[PDB]
Copies of this chain bind each other. A is one copy, B any other.
């Protein structure tokens, strides 16, 4: 018997190579698009806002001393932080596999821009980390919660809390799973609130566009008027340059690929942003 088994004549048939590398899931990047985009050539930014307006205007009696009003200001600052990462690779692998070069590039760029979004949303603000939308955002007012509200009502409430500062909301950001359970709400009869089984509902509720992103922690939601509340400032766009003289590199026949970027997130009106937690 002459089979294709390993311990036989199966050594003459070479498996067909399928051209192309299989990348994982590429998350549809958002947030950075929700915010305004500007450019700078400095290392930091300074803007001014009205801090405290002491309005004492009132009715005045004839021949009497009038009320003295006062106004306070502040110098708000936004430092430029640097985000990046490098990869050390063997010169062999890079030469034996040509396509690899341009592959790593298109990967680090994504990997970078991913943490970029990850910062803008949940920035620790701890020294180097950017002050993300959530660390800034004004907490949701629990007092708005009425008896017997659905998770949908809560968002509706949040949207209003933005108006409580005379500002129109831009969009709604929630974890994909939450948005799911929400779109699948039913009434005391059984009908679907957003859309019968016929077709899935559009990513829109209460007149505002919904943005489901895995970048948003589960059970957490952020509503606000991003289009006119915060702005991203680019000092240096995401660039990728390679060098094989970096330290040991030349003597070890190595190759170092770098992918850096410089940002700065500014939060003009923090009152126009709201963060909260759903009730489990």
Contact = CB atoms under 8 A, between A and B. Distances in A.
Interface of A: 1, 3-5, 10, 13-18, 20-28, 40-50, 53, 55-64, 66-71, 73, 75, 77, 80-88, 90-92, 96-97, 104, 107-108, 111-112, 114-115, 118-119, 123-124, 127-130, 144, 146, 148, 150, 152-153, 156-157, 159-160, 163-168, 176-177, 180-181, 184-201, 204-208, 212, 214, 233, 243, 245-247, 249-251, 253, 256, 258, 260, 266, 268-269, 271-272
A84 B57 contact: yes
A268 B130 CA distance: 28
Contact of A160 (B4, B104, B180): B180
A84 B76 CA distance: 25
A200 B115 CA distance: 32
Contact of A191 (B82, B159, B187): B187
Contacts of A185: 197
Given A26-B166, A80-B96, A127-B90, A1 B63 contact: yes
B21 A46 contact: no
Nearest to A167: B25
A129 to B, nearest CB: 5
B194 A191 contact: no
Contact of A22 (B153, B189, B192, B268): B268
Contact of A46 (B17, B24, B165, B195): B17
